[PDB]
Every structure is written in structure tokens, then in C-alpha cells.
């Protein structure tokens, strides 16, 4: 469940880009 | 899209160099533009990313690379106090874990 | 301290035909946001998969992703002579305004024709 620092996929966000 | 790094060359110990990563067909604001390098026989290292105007460095890199954009096309990698340990082939990659890269551009610190 | 990513085996070796895998270790909990590489001279290295278990696009499906949090797998089954190569594995996170970019160490993969 979300909490604390969320982690961001960098490598999702480039390959939706 | 394209990416093409230059810059590389001879450099002596102690030496600093620039070199350049120039996208073709994208807009490179909108990416992590990340350095890695891979010294010959070794394994890839990141060095260091760049988003927009937010930059993020390795700790084994911090205050030696520094990372900017410098036209709608390019960022640099400026690299200061060269020795050996860092003749590498340096590529640019399209995002943190990304898949588009360019071909390399080789750095070879000797004197 | 940055995330290190411990990759293992060094080496693997199958023959033609056969199945081998990789593991990597996060010291750090990155979810799935970790990618795997295929490294050949001549070319860059290639992206194979990223968020752990989406394929890249032209990677045929004898390559599967599995894990998530600090435990990571890349299996390459109906191995080829096509796939011998060195594979990295790299964290591809941002956490608490940090980026989580560190690489695995590699695994080169001999395939037995």
C-alpha cells in the first residue's frame, strides 16, 4: 500500500513518453 | 528518433573534458537524459541523469561530472581531474532505463 | 548510499536450445521499476525488458522478467546462439528525489552450439 517515499518507475515513464 | 555523442578523445592525466550528447527528433526536455559509461572489459556505470532543469548524479560522480543543458538539442558532460580509471566509452541514453542510445564516444586518459 | 545491484552469476552457459537465468539483488526496495539490457560489440546495449516483466518491443518471448521489490530474474529459454551476450540488470527509479540508476554488475551468457 502506498506509503512513506512512493517509488516512480523512470523506465515506465520513458517508455510511455 | 537519434542520439550521437561526441567529444571523446586523448586526454592527459589531470586533464578535464567536455563532451556532448546531441538528440535528433525529440525533445529532450521532456526525458532523463542519463550518461553512463563502460570502461573496456567492464560493466556499464551510471553516471548521472538530467530532467528538464532537476540533475542527479551518482555518488561516485558528484562534484568531478557536472551535467547541463546547452541548446534545445544537446547536454554536456563536463568531467574534471581525468586519470585512468576513467577511460571509458561514454553513451547517452533516452531515460533512466531507456532504449534509445547512441553509439558511444570513446575517452582515453594516458599522457 | 546509492542502491547497489548485486548480479549473479558472473557466467552461465547452456547449450542451444536450453534455459538459463540470472538473478538480481537490490539493496534497496525499487518495486518493478528495474530493466534488463543485452549487450553485443557493434551496437549499444539493447533494452530487453523494463518494469520487471514488459517485453521491449521486438524481444521475442523466450525472454522473461520476474520479481519485484529487491529480488529480480531474467530466464531466457529455447536459448540461441543469437543471444549470447553480456545482460545487466539496472534499477530505473526515482525515490524521495533521488534516482535509483545504479547497474548489476553483468552476467555473460555462453551458448553451446
Known amino acids: 500500500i502506498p506509503n512513506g517515499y512512493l517509488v516512480l518507475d523512470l523506465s515506465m515513464q520513458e517508455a510511455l513518453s | 528518433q537519434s542520439l550521437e555523442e561526441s567529444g571523446g578523445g586523448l586526454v592527459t592525466p589531470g586533464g578535464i573534458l567536455t563532451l556532448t550528447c546531441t538528440a535528433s527528433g525529440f525533445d529532450i526536455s521532456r526525458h532523463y537524459m542519463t550518461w553512463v559509461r563502460q570502461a573496456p572489459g567492464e560493466g556499464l556505470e551510471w553516471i548521472g541523469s538530467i530532467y528538464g532543469g532537476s540533475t542527479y548524479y551518482a555518488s561516485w560522480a558528484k562534484g568531478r561530472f557536472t551535467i547541463s543543458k546547452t541548446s534545445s538539442t544537446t547536454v554536456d558532460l563536463k568531467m574534471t581531474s581525468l586519470t585512468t580509471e576513467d577511460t571509458a566509452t561514454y553513451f547517452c541514453?533516452?531515460?533512466?532505463?531507456?532504449?534509445?542510445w547512441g553509439p558511444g564516444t570513446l575517452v582515453t586518459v594516458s599522457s | 548510499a546509492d542502491v547497489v545491484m548485486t548480479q549473479t552469476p558472473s557466467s552461465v552457459s547452456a547449450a542451444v536450445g536450453g534455459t538459463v537465468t540470472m538473478k538480481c539483488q537490490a539493496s534497496?526496495?525499487?518495486?518493478?521499476?528495474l530493466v534488463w539490457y543485452q549487450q553485443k560489440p557493434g551496437q549499444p546495449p539493447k533494452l530487453l525488458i523494463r518494469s520487471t516483466s514488459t517485453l521491449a518491443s521486438g524481444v521475442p518471448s523466450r525472454f522473461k522478467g520476474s520479481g519485484s521489490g529487491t529480488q529480480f530474474t531474467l530466464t531466457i529459454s529455447d536459448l540461441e546462439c543469437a543471444d549470447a551476450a553480456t545482460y545487466y540488470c539496472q534499477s530505473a527509479a526515482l525515490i524521495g528525489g533521488v534516482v535509483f540508476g545504479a547497474f548489476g554488475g553483468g552476467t555473460e551468457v555462453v551458448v553451446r552450439g
Open positions: 534497496q526496495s525499487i518495486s518493478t521499476a
Open positions: 541514453v533516452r531515460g533512466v532505463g531507456g532504449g534509445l
